[PDB]
Each structure stands twice: as C-alpha cells, then as structure tokens.
Amino acid sequence: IPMVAPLAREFRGSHTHRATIVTRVHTDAGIIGEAYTGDEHETMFDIDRIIHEELAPTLIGQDAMAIERLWDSGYKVTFDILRDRRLGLVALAAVNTAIWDAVGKALKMPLWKLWGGYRNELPMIAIGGYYGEPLGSIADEMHNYQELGLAGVKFKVGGLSAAEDAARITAAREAAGDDFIICIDANQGYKPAVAVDLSRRIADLNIRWFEEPVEWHNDKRSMRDVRYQGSVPVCAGQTEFSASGCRDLMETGAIDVCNFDSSWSGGPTAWLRTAAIATSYDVQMGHHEEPQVSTHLLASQPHGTIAECFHPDRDPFWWNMITNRPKLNNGTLTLSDRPGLGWDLNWDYID
Amino acid sequence: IPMVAPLAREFRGSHTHRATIVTRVHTDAGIIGEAYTGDEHETMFDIDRIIHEELAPTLIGQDAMAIERLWDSGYKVTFDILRDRRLGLVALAAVNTAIWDAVGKALKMPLWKLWGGYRNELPMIAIGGYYGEPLGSIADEMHNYQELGLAGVKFKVGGLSAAEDAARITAAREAAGDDFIICIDANQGYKPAVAVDLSRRIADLNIRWFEEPVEWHNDKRSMRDVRYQGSVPVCAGQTEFSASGCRDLMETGAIDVCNFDSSWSGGPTAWLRTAAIATSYDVQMGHHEEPQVSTHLLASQPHGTIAECFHPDRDPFWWNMITNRPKLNNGTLTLSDRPGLGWDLNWDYIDQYRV
Amino acid sequence: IPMVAPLAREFRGSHTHRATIVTRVHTDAGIIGEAYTGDEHETMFDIDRIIHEELAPTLIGQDAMAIERLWDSGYKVTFDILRDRRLGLVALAAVNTAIWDAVGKALKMPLWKLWGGYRNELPMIAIGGYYGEPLGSIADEMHNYQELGLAGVKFKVGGLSAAEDAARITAAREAAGDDFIICIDANQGYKPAVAVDLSRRIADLNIRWFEEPVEWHNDKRSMRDVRYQGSVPVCAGQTEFSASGCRDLMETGAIDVCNFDSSWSGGPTAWLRTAAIATSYDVQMGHHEEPQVSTHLLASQPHGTIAECFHPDRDPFWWNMITNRPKLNNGTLTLSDRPGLGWDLNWDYID
Amino acid sequence: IPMVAPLAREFRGTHRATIVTRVHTDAGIIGEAYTGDEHETMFDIDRIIHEELAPTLIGQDAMAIERLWDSGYKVTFDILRDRRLGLVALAAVNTAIWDAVGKALKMPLWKLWGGYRNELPMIAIGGYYGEPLGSIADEMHNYQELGLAGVKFKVGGLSAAEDAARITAAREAAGDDFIICIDANQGYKPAVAVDLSRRIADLNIRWFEEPVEWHNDKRSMRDVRYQGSVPVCAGQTEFSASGCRDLMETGAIDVCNFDSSWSGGPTAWLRTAAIATSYDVQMGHHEEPQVSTHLLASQPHGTIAECFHPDRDPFWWNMITNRPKLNNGTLTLSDRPGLGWDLNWDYID
Amino acid sequence: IPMVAPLAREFRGSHTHRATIVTRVHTDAGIIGEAYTGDEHETMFDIDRIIHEELAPTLIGQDAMAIERLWDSGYKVTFDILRDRRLGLVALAAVNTAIWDAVGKALKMPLWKLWGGYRNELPMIAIGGYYGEPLGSIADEMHNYQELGLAGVKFKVGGLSAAEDAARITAAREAAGDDFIICIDANQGYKPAVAVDLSRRIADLNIRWFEEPVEWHNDKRSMRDVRYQGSVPVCAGQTEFSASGCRDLMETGAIDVCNFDSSWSGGPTAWLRTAAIATSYDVQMGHHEEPQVSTHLLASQPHGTIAECFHPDRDPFWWNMITNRPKLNNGTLTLSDRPGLGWDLNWDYID
C-alpha cells in the first residue's frame, strides 16, 4: 500500500496547556492511518517541520508494510548533532504510530493483537496527587477516581521529605481502601537516602512501584540502591532515549518495571524492541501516560502491566479526542476489535 | 597405581523409581575403587556406553594417581555437540568418583580428610515437603525426620501462591520447633515477584535458605533480585554444567550458597574447583543430594554447610546400599577413618536389582 | 612561591602509643607550610627517610603553587616494589598536606574554603567502644563523650557474635539516648552472614553506618551484600591505597560512604579526587581519623559527612597539639577564617 | 567576594552565537567569560541565567564555589525541557565565577586548578565536507601556516574507503610532524568504524572521536577500541561526570573530551578529570579554547586544546585581543589572573 | 600425624642480598616437613616472630593431615589491621609449605603429583635482562642462559621508551634465536599508551607474555586494555594478596597468565585455589620465581606454564640450596618420585 501524503494538525488547550500533533498518512488504498502523540508545546512546530521536510520525503511512495525499512531510514533524524535528540525521536514516533495504525487497518487487525494479542484488557490508573491540591484533598481526589471507575492512581511525590510524603501516601491508601492500585512517582526528585527512607516508611501500604525515585545524573546506579535497600519495586524508562538506555537500566538492576514512552522514543517499533528485551530480564512493561497507544502496546504483551491517563481537567485530549473510548469496567479497559488503534476522533473538538 | 579395569553395575529399584550406576576401578595393586553415582534412568545406558567406549580407553593402563592428567583427557567426552552435555558429565563424574576412592585407599586416607579435613562431622537434612503429602501431613513428616535423627529439612515449594506456600512452611516450622533447620526448594518454579512475596512472608521463621526460587531462562539475575529484595539467603548451582556456570552465579551476586552437584557435573575434581572458587566470593558450599559423596566433599571444606538425603521411601539406596553407614546423632553425621569413601556396599541388595 | 627547605619533626607519645610526623615546608617568602600526619610508629623513621631522600629533591627550588606538578613527580615513591606501598603513600601525603597549608596561607585562604567551601561547620564523633572497656563501661563512656560536646561515637565491634555485639550496641544507644549519632566499626572482623545478622538486629537503634563489616579478601563484594541484605548503610575506603581502589568499592555498589584516609594514601590531592569520584556515584564522603585535616576536607564538600576523633586518653595529639582547636558545640565544629589549615601547634608540647 | 550583579551580553556573527557572562562583585572584580555556541535556544538559556540562577547568587560568597554550584544545579531538574539549557546556563555562571575568584586570588586558572603546566599543543577542527576551506592539502598547509599543531579531521560521512583516502591525503600534505585526530560525530556503524580504524593504522592517527552511532556508543565504540588500531575519544555528548564515568567504566575511551561550556562549567569538568585519572583516561575538551586551555593545562593527564579556522569561528580570533602566540603548534598561557583574556569591546558591541 | 615443633632458621646471603626462612615442621612420626619460602630481608625477623608467637600455637599437638582446618586457623594472622598484610601472608605461607612437605612425606607422594599429577616435566626460564647490564651485554647474557640449559628468559623492561625497549628486546631475540622463550616484565613501569606501543612494536618477535606492564593504581583495567590494544598475552597476579584479587584480574579480563606467588600469599593452599579459579576462566597459571616450590605447583596443573629461576649471580638459593636439582635437558626440568618437595637442602650453605 503506497503512501501518498502525511498531514499533521496542531492542537492546544488550557486547563498550563495541552498540545499534541495529530498525524495522518493517506495511502493509495482507501486507508488513512491516524494517531495523535506527544503533548509537546514550545517545540511543537520544530517537530512538525522535521516530519514534513525530513521524514515525509523518505516516505511518500513507499510501501507502508515494510516498517523496519521505513523506520530504519527515518531513524536518521536522530543523528542531527545541533538539536535536542527528542525532536527527532518524537517526530519519528509520530509517523511510526500513524503508519502502524494504517497497517493494522489494512490487515484488518486491531493493534493489540497484531503486536502479540496477549490479552485485550488491562487495568488503568490516573496520574494524580499533584502538589497544591489542584484537584482537592487526597480524600476527594481519590474518591473521584473511584467514581470514574479507575483501577488506581500514580500519586506524585518527590517534593517533600520522606516523613511528609509518607503521610500523603498514607492518606491516599486510607481514602481509597486496599482495593485500589497505588503507584508513587517522584520525577527524579529525591536523593538516594531520602527515597530509601520513604520506600521503607510505606512498606506496609502496598505500593505497586516507586517511579523515578532519584536525581537524574546517576539514576541507574542510585535507583538500584533504592530498589535493594527499599521495600517497594522501582520503575523507570520514560527518561531514556532508546532501547539501549532501557537495557542499561535493566543491566544495572535498577528496575522491576520499564515505562518507556513510545511517543517520546521513536514509536511502537522502538517500544516493542524494549518490550522484547524486558522479557530476557524478567522486567515488566509499563508506559508513561499516552493511553491512546499504551493500551494496545501493553495489552499485547505477556508482561504488560497497567495503562495510565490523567484527570479530565489535567488532560482533555484523552477524554474528548476519542468518542469510542471504552467504559471502565471496574478498573479494567477492554480494547475493541476495531483495526489499528481503532479510535474515533472528534473533529469538532479538534478545531 | 596402574589401571586394570572398570566394572559398571547399573540397577533400578522402585519406591517412581531409583536408578544409578555402580562404578568400580580395579588397580594392579590390591585396591578396588568403587562408588555409586547419579540418578539417571532413561539415559542410564547411554551414559554406560560413554563410560566404557569413551572413558575406559584413557584410563586402563594409566596411573590412577595422576587424577588431573586423567580428568583432562576424559573431559573431551563432554565436547560432543549432538548429545545432551549431561551425559558426558555424568559419565566423567562416575569414573572420577571411583578413582578418588581408589587413591584414598592407596593412601589409606578417608576422602573427607584427603580433600581438606576441615572437619569429619556435619549436620544432615532430608529433602521433603512434597505436595500431595505422600509422606503424611507436614506435621507427621517433620516428626518422622526428627525422630530419625535428621538435622532439618529442605521443604518443597514453588507450586502454589505465595500465600499458600507460606502457610505450608509455617506448619513445618511450627510442628518442628526452633531446633530444626528449614530450607525451601522451588525447583525454579516461581516468577521473581512471587518468590519475593514468599521470601518476605517467611522472614521471621528462620529459613536457612531459598533454593532455586525463579524460572530457568534468567535465573542468575532474577534470583539475584530475590536475594536483595527478599529476606532469606539464596542457593543454586545444581542446574549448572560446570564450575564456570557457578562462577557466573557468584559474580552475579545471585547466591549465598552454591549446591553444585558433583555426580551431575564431572565428579569431585570439578566440585572442588567450584568450592575453591566459592571461597574467593565468600559463598558457602552445599551439595545437592548424593550423600554417599557430599558428606566427604562438604566435610572437607572450611565453608561446607550441610549434607542431604531423603526419606527411605523417596530414596532407598542411601539406606540399603551402604552397610557401615554412621548412625545419625542429633542432626549430625560423623565420618570414620575408613580410607576412600569408606563405605561397605550391600551386594545382596545390588545383586537383587541389577539390570 | 619556591621551596627553600622541608623540615621534619618526629615524635612519639605514650598513652600502644601515639606517634606522628610533623612536616614543615619553607618558602622563599616568609611562609611555612606545616602539618602533622599519619600515626606510623615502627615505620616512622623509614617514612622520614623517604620524605627527605626521595621527595625533597623534587620539591626544593620548585613552585609550591603547582600542586599537580609536584604531586605527579612525588607519586613515584609509591612505585617501589620492595616495600609496603603505604610507606611511600604516607610520605607523599605528609609533604602534600604541608604544601597545601602553604598555598592556603599564601592565598590568605582557609583550606576548607579553598577546597570547595561548601560549609564551615560539621559534627564530630568519637571513636570508642573498645573491647576490654579501657575507658570504663559502655554507659560511662557514651556519657563521657556527651559531656565533651561530641556529636556521637563510632563503636568498635567485629570481635564477638552478632547477638553479643548487638547487646553492646543497644547498651550504648540506651545510655546515650536518641539525640546521639552511632556508627559501628568492625575492622573487617565478621563473615558476611554474621554482619548481616547483626545489621538486622540493630535495625531499630538508628545506626548511621556500618564501617568495614566483612573480612578483607572479598570485602568489596561481601560488604555489597551486607548492604543489600542488611538494614544499615555501609562505609569503607580507608583500607584502599588509592582513588581507584575507592572507585571499585563504588563500582561494586559496596558503600554508602567512602572513608578514604588522606594521610594514609597520598594526601588532600588524592582525597579530593576520590571526593569527585563520589559525587558521580551519589556516595557520601567521610574520613578515617586525622581531624586536623579531615575537618577541612569534609567541610569543603557538599557530600561531606562527619569528622572523627579519639578520647583524650587514646589520642593526646588532637587535644594537646592544637592550641586554637575549635570548640565542640553540642556535637558540632566550626572552622575559623584563618589561611591554610589555620592551626597553632603547641610547641610547648612537641617536646 | 559577594555577588552584586550578573550581566549577560549575547551576540551573533551558518552562524556563531555566544553569551558573554559577567559577574560583578562587592570588590571591583568582574568575572567575565563567553561560553558555548547556542543560537536557537540562546534566549532561553539567558532567561534561566537571570530568572533561575541570578537569585541563587546575588549577595553570596563567590569563593564558596561548591555551595553556589550546588544550589544552581537544580536548574537541571526541570523535566519539561532539554537538559542542556540549565546545563549551559550553569556553565556560563560557573565559568564567570571562576575567573572572578581567580582574579581575587591573583591566580591564573591554569595554575589555580592544578598548575601541572602552562603550555600545550593546539589543533584546529576542519577538513569539512565540501572543502569550504579549500582542498585538503591547502587547508592542511593553511593550518601549518597558522602554526597549529595539527587538525581534527571530520569523517563519519563516507565509506571507510573514501574517508581513509581523505585522511591519507591529509597525512601526505602535512607530513609526519603534525597531529591528526579524526572526528565522525557519531556517524559510523561499528563495523564501518573498525574498517576505517584498520585502514589508517599507519598514518599515525592521534585519536578517533565519536566513531559510532549514538544509541549504543559506549559498548560499540569500545569494540572499535579493541578491534581497531587507534585510540578512541568521547565525552562531549555526555550530560555529566556520571555519563563520563560510564564511558570509562565500559572501557569505551582513551581520551575524554567532556565539554565544560555544555555540562555545568569547570566545576563539573574538573570532577570528570579527577575520575579520569583513576581510569588512566586522558582529558580532552570539545572546542571552547578560551576555557579549555586552562582546564587541560592544569591536569597531569591533559592533552590538546581545539579551535577552528578564523572563517568558521570569529570569536576566539576577534574577541580576545591577547591570545598567546603559537610556537611549533604549542601555546603558553600567561600569569594573568583568572582566565586572563582581554575581550574586544569594539567587536562585542 | 601430630606436630611437635616448628623450627625456623633465618638466612642471609650477600650477592644486594638474598634472604629467606627455612621452616621445619616436626611430627610425632619420623617425618619433618621442611622448606625455605620467599625473600624478605628487613621484615624477616618480624615474619619469623609471627610464626612462633602467632602460628605455632595453632599447630603444636595438631593433626598436620588436616590442612584446611589448620590453614583456616592460621589465616587470622592476616587480620592484623596495623601492619603490612604481607607479613602474615608470608608467615602463613612458610608454615603451609612446610606442612605440605610433611604430608607428602607421610603419604610418600611427591607434591607435583599429590597436587594433581598432570605431568612431572616442565620448562624453566631465567629472570634477566636487567638495566645497566650487570650480567654482561644482552647477547652474552642470552648465550649464558642457553649454555646453562635454560629454555628462555624473562627480560626486564618498563624503564625506557617503547622504542628503546623494543630494541633491547630485539637484541635478545636476535642473540637467542627462535629456540628460546621470551617473556618480558615491566614491573608496573609503563603508562598504558607506552605499553601498547611497545606491545605493537614487538608483535613479530614471538613474545610469550607481557608481565605487569602498567602502573599500579589502575593496573587491572589498564592492562586489560594493553591486552586488547596490544599484541602479546598479559601476565600478572604476583602483586595480588589473595585468590580474590586474582579472581578480580580475571573477571576484568586483564590477564592470560596468573603468576600468583605462593610463598608471598599464604602458600600452596592459597595458590591451588587461584589455580582452580583460573581453569573456570581459561586462564593459564604461572608463578613468580620460587622454583623450589613452583616446579611442583605448575606441573600438577593441566594449565601450568613455565617455572622461573634467577641467574646464579642474581640468586644463589635455587642453584646452591638444593643439593639435588634435576638437570636441565632441552630447557625442561624433570621431577622425581621423592615425597613432598623431594629436596635435599644444602645444610653446609645453611649453617
């Protein structure tokens, strides 16, 4: 199926702001592959430019079925020495996502199955527990996510001290009950000793995992210590650039869960390689937000964990962009059989 | 001490069965080295062929005293790339053990001493806790073991959820009291996360060690993690083919104790290499089953731990094969000064099950 | 700022004994660099011989300002194949510390500031808890240290069973109360299993760190395990000959704190290098004894920890050698703004 | 010396862009320096310098380097932007502070940072594809004229065969006594890089900089190091001392060219240097000669300073009016305090 | 067989000098285990002292047949944290070797065979090529070693540039011809770059191995590099304190041959463990000098290489202390069936 044209529409919404780039790739057949990815702002147009003048050229007229070849060719945009490597990886991820959506449709295959079809449903939690209580107190916020029918939450920490953040984590546990998944994300905020201290303080609250517990410079070796001296499993990966970066994390013994973001690292083709390596290390797979694509990627794997999304006011793109978004049935989301990503977009909202 | 002949006597005995080969190395002096090794059944005869057709040629007429020269030549049988590598290892181990017995007798030295002589006594446990209670309830099984003089038990697990298995281990601990050693064996049965769950659940039960907790493909690194995220020491090495494999285990930080099985990996010569490696990594040595050889090996090393055997039902050989077997006295077994393995084989028994 | 002469003044003092070599480096200016370092009794004269016959010829006439150059040529004394490598390392440190004291003075800069200037105040613990109770019972001793203004103690262990030594530590904790710092020092006396056992027992006594828990031959890896299987952080680095040796310790994941001794392996120049290597591994810096120098080294670093000393009956030097010794204030110490090491040696004592 | 103010003067000469950072003190001392070559993000890094860094410095003791550097380090914690922005803003401030404390102490940085030596060879970065500076032979001779010690020849863009030919040419034109480092800019496939390395084993190449693709450089360039014939150099792409420790721990490099203006300033660069000594790796430095000359000179394992042709980099040549004269490709630093450079305010405006 | 008395006889012979300790372990049987170990001169009486006051107490009345037990008990002497660890290792080694000779005699087994019996025949080379040419010119020296029947020489280097040393090595190869083994030893004298350069320079002279090429501090990694960037095998280990240290050199991929010295690190019991570690690493075994002991250690091992001795003028102890050295034939030495080390010491030379 030759490709005829890749177009891209730019978004922006407030709540400070949410942006994304809808990418579509029309083919010589009647199929149009589409997916929106990346929530990037200040660099949204340098990325859109990379897609039209750098990636577009090596795609137009190519067989959309030979993904390895196309991906191999577009992977050169990550070689530019003068710009932030992410601009090339996010652009590449955008085209790789839209293409994959096209191939699935052309094979009449939902992406969760084309990628392995381990299962068509998984739990989904919400990223909350933001400092400042912009969503109310931990009690109200936690109960709101339950009413929404979510499986659990990715509670934010890393801003206060072990003791203080330990209270907040405890408040959540008590408000939601034991029948709620609770993960904690530090965003690389703690120094190794603080994170260990915290890890031990909540050893009894049943925390799913401690996401990016320590500072950035030596996170591999440091979260490894937090992992072996702490009481809760460690998760990371979103900050890596490629599969090689997630492998190094795994080799260092720093993680239990890898949350490599495909929208940030070159698309599903890159994420599926990380996925395969995770099996050889017995490491579970996760995915930093991006529900529109994580659900399929995760579900498709025997080691996939949970899917993540934000509160409707934190992220409008997932609650409005999709009109056929499955109903949360007791925390778990079941993917349909609709080929590709199988999503129905909302063009009135798009504009 | 020239090599005149190798006699092989394999035999099966049902309890579903117990098999082994008895190897005998005759010498031009009066001496006759012998020992029974391994528990191969379906491949037993392939191993027999490797022994007489591949190993005997390099032994007959050679100086049994130059064990390294002999081991070096025979090691090549493990090079065949079209067969299971274990066949060559079990063959090499069988003959190697026999020779050591011969040299022990020629030197009028009991192996536990000729190999080191750290001590001549050590505790022994029984491998039990089988699912299905084939030996009675957990309680009855431990009591039977204590009354038999055993030091403790290597309890089976790896077949249920962390909750279930933890409950089963409690019973065992609860039924035997504190003066009893308790190790657990999952046989590579759990997924890392589950192994860790269990490990922490039995943290206050004084569990000697968690043997082979995780699945086979990534066992080294995964059990490494069960070792640092869990609460109990970890043991492995039995599934390794050689000393190198064990070294990787120790270099990975996977084990606290290595249970390299000599009968399965080239005999005492290779085991002692592994045990030497173990000392540089401060890893304690253990040995999976084979009490007729492990007692000497483990007793000779400064870092040796405990020997293992089964219930007479599970394994009839240890109890019926040896005649001058020492009486278990309150968990420990002390070796005599009898040269070599110093064992007295019961040929009425052997003759009864020869094949 | 050239060299005019190196003066050495050896002396012993009995309580087995306390020995040390005072070194003075004279400049063409009116400045004299001086410092006492070590505690090498029997090999004392051997060291002074190295200082005079091997190092002096590479310093006289040279510029003291070029620390890196003088160091690089002096390090040759560590190459001798026929003697303990410590001999050459101690001699190089003896002159290296004095030289630093000289440029410190010639720059009107107190060493803690010249070497980084992170802070100018830090806690100090006493190294006691000796088997045989040479300073009374554990209760009397901890109190004796509290009355002196010390922040805590580094308790000696490594000689008895985990249970016994665990009771000993509980005694010190129970006597001092919670507002006291407690570290334990095994001096490479335990087997890993015993160390991990002990570590779990004292888990509720809030131990700052477990210094050199295991036997020497496989210490790196063995203590890494006591770190991941145990409950308290591990410290080591004094037994190491160089920055590289401390790096291995760090690369193995063996330590939480590196206590590399400036005086035992080259001097401040080597110590500072190890400190930089530690920042890269999120490892904190400590320093085995040598308060007359450790205070300046540790105070300058952002990851610096605690300074250490001995009871006056154990080490008369730190307590009698310095006439302007800083005052302990509820466990803390503060350095003046005086150039170099800023110390006033009591010559009424050096005799 | 307390901070009284930090002034930022950025300018532009396909382009050259830098920020001249100046740190005013309570005394009459002003720590100044220009650092890095950011053009697109220039104004964002300038903003980080005044809105995020300035507050942590005004009224502080410039002497306590560790303390100041330690609080300004958080500019690198922002998860929503290139990490390089804070890193660059931090280097700018840290570099200007060093010159200040250097001037306050009457010490030239090359000596204050160690003072191993005051002289070192300097090579130029050239041999650009397209021959913008003329044929290889003429560009080599041109650098010979200028008295440079050698060149850092660009490669990584053609076949092992072609680049080897280009590199040979250079050897042919320059002679034997001329340093020749090659630079791929992470452009080769491991296999191709070994091929090139082997082919040039007799041209006496000083080192091979960033030979293989970025994604797995550590392990990959390490293989080039062991399967090839010439020493490998990398580090400029690392964000920190830790990244550099990794290249070293992996056995990837022979020389580390960590870039000071790019990763936090001299305070960070000197940490990577301490580390390197423990691995016996030599220290190099990606361009920025106005700062690298002192850093490298001060270390016992220092190697070479780098600069560009007057056509490619006007700043070094036009801004500092008292650049040392080259002698057989070697450069001697003066005893002037701090960095000792005298900017050209005419050119600045 | 019980031990009744450990007798030591200090040895001092001028050439600077050769010193050694002749240790004799007496038993209630006829047997007397005897041997002379290492070369310590000034620390000599310290070592001798450690033997009588620290080790003899743990041997008298004991069973010499229980080596592991005895060795494990003697090891504690290497625990003294206040003195060069070598003193205890050398004392431990003296006692251990003497005991092995006793058990070999009690078992009527020659050690080479009791330790393995791989072979009773191995080649021997001489340590030579000393700077200053005190043993004549290179050619003269090579021809000397050949007329003596030696199989080769261990040529000294590490003092000059790669070029000049490459020529010294060239002179030797050219004076000895190809029928000669040529190993080189830098005694940790070069910098990595210079050693690689020298290694690449001599790639055609057929050099058996490059011994301790680089400086001490980071020798493990730095020699791995010499090994992979150079052209000749690398040998080291004699500078290591234990088998763990040799295990580290192996895990780092630094050597091809391990020349761990028994008389310097705890004796045969220790060296045999290192030998076993070495087979799991496909690394060959060597032995820094001590031919009176190494001949048996190396021959017993299937991966043993070459025994080393000195020129009669560099060391008279191997040529005069052993009244019954087998004669060199075609550069190889052949061991007899005499129990233990099977040597007849020259008591004339001893008194």
PDB file of N, CA and C in Angstrom, chain C residues 270-292:
ATOM      1  N   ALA C 270      44.842  13.472  46.619  1.00  0.00           N
ATOM      2  CA  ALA C 270      44.261  12.173  46.295  1.00  0.00           C
ATOM      3  C   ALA C 270      42.886  12.100  46.932  1.00  0.00           C
ATOM      4  N   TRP C 271      42.762  12.643  48.134  1.00  0.00           N
ATOM      5  CA  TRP C 271      41.481  12.604  48.801  1.00  0.00           C
ATOM      6  C   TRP C 271      40.444  13.355  47.976  1.00  0.00           C
ATOM      7  N   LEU C 272      40.799  14.556  47.540  1.00  0.00           N
ATOM      8  CA  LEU C 272      39.888  15.356  46.744  1.00  0.00           C
ATOM      9  C   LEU C 272      39.428  14.628  45.477  1.00  0.00           C
ATOM     10  N   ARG C 273      40.323  13.856  44.856  1.00  0.00           N
ATOM     11  CA  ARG C 273      39.966  13.099  43.654  1.00  0.00           C
ATOM     12  C   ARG C 273      38.903  12.066  43.978  1.00  0.00           C
ATOM     13  N   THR C 274      39.080  11.365  45.090  1.00  0.00           N
ATOM     14  CA  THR C 274      38.100  10.375  45.495  1.00  0.00           C
ATOM     15  C   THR C 274      36.758  11.070  45.755  1.00  0.00           C
ATOM     16  N   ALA C 275      36.812  12.275  46.311  1.00  0.00           N
ATOM     17  CA  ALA C 275      35.602  13.034  46.592  1.00  0.00           C
ATOM     18  C   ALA C 275      34.841  13.338  45.296  1.00  0.00           C
ATOM     19  N   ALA C 276      35.567  13.681  44.231  1.00  0.00           N
ATOM     20  CA  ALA C 276      34.920  13.976  42.953  1.00  0.00           C
ATOM     21  C   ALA C 276      34.314  12.704  42.392  1.00  0.00           C
ATOM     22  N   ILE C 277      35.022  11.590  42.536  1.00  0.00           N
ATOM     23  CA  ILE C 277      34.508  10.323  42.029  1.00  0.00           C
ATOM     24  C   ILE C 277      33.219   9.947  42.773  1.00  0.00           C
ATOM     25  N   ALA C 278      33.138  10.315  44.053  1.00  0.00           N
ATOM     26  CA  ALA C 278      31.958  10.016  44.862  1.00  0.00           C
ATOM     27  C   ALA C 278      30.709  10.794  44.429  1.00  0.00           C
ATOM     28  N   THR C 279      30.895  12.038  44.004  1.00  0.00           N
ATOM     29  CA  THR C 279      29.770  12.855  43.581  1.00  0.00           C
ATOM     30  C   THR C 279      29.073  12.182  42.403  1.00  0.00           C
ATOM     31  N   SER C 280      29.858  11.549  41.542  1.00  0.00           N
ATOM     32  CA  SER C 280      29.336  10.857  40.368  1.00  0.00           C
ATOM     33  C   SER C 280      28.535   9.600  40.689  1.00  0.00           C
ATOM     34  N   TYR C 281      28.786   9.018  41.857  1.00  0.00           N
ATOM     35  CA  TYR C 281      28.102   7.807  42.296  1.00  0.00           C
ATOM     36  C   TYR C 281      27.078   8.067  43.406  1.00  0.00           C
ATOM     37  N   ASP C 282      26.854   9.325  43.771  1.00  0.00           N
ATOM     38  CA  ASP C 282      25.930   9.633  44.868  1.00  0.00           C
ATOM     39  C   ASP C 282      26.410   8.950  46.146  1.00  0.00           C
ATOM     40  N   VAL C 283      27.727   8.923  46.333  1.00  0.00           N
ATOM     41  CA  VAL C 283      28.337   8.337  47.520  1.00  0.00           C
ATOM     42  C   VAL C 283      28.774   9.508  48.400  1.00  0.00           C
ATOM     43  N   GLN C 284      28.561   9.398  49.707  1.00  0.00           N
ATOM     44  CA  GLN C 284      28.955  10.476  50.614  1.00  0.00           C
ATOM     45  C   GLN C 284      30.391  10.276  51.044  1.00  0.00           C
ATOM     46  N   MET C 285      31.062  11.374  51.382  1.00  0.00           N
ATOM     47  CA  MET C 285      32.451  11.313  51.825  1.00  0.00           C
ATOM     48  C   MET C 285      32.592  11.379  53.343  1.00  0.00           C
ATOM     49  N   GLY C 286      33.515  10.563  53.842  1.00  0.00           N
ATOM     50  CA  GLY C 286      33.830  10.511  55.252  1.00  0.00           C
ATOM     51  C   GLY C 286      35.347  10.580  55.311  1.00  0.00           C
ATOM     52  N   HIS C 287      35.925  10.383  56.491  1.00  0.00           N
ATOM     53  CA  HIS C 287      37.380  10.408  56.629  1.00  0.00           C
ATOM     54  C   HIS C 287      37.820   9.800  57.953  1.00  0.00           C
ATOM     55  N   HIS C 288      38.548   8.697  57.833  1.00  0.00           N
ATOM     56  CA  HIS C 288      39.076   7.963  58.965  1.00  0.00           C
ATOM     57  C   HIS C 288      40.079   8.789  59.788  1.00  0.00           C
ATOM     58  N   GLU C 289      39.653   9.227  60.972  1.00  0.00           N
ATOM     59  CA  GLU C 289      40.501   9.998  61.887  1.00  0.00           C
ATOM     60  C   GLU C 289      41.121  11.245  61.257  1.00  0.00           C
ATOM     61  N   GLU C 290      42.334  11.593  61.689  1.00  0.00           N
ATOM     62  CA  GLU C 290      43.050  12.760  61.171  1.00  0.00           C
ATOM     63  C   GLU C 290      42.192  14.042  61.193  1.00  0.00           C
ATOM     64  N   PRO C 291      41.578  14.351  62.342  1.00  0.00           N
ATOM     65  CA  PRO C 291      40.733  15.544  62.470  1.00  0.00           C
ATOM     66  C   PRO C 291      41.391  16.859  62.048  1.00  0.00           C
ATOM     67  N   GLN C 292      42.695  16.975  62.299  1.00  0.00           N
ATOM     68  CA  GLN C 292      43.458  18.185  61.974  1.00  0.00           C
ATOM     69  C   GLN C 292      43.397  18.483  60.492  1.00  0.00           C
TER      70      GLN C 292
END
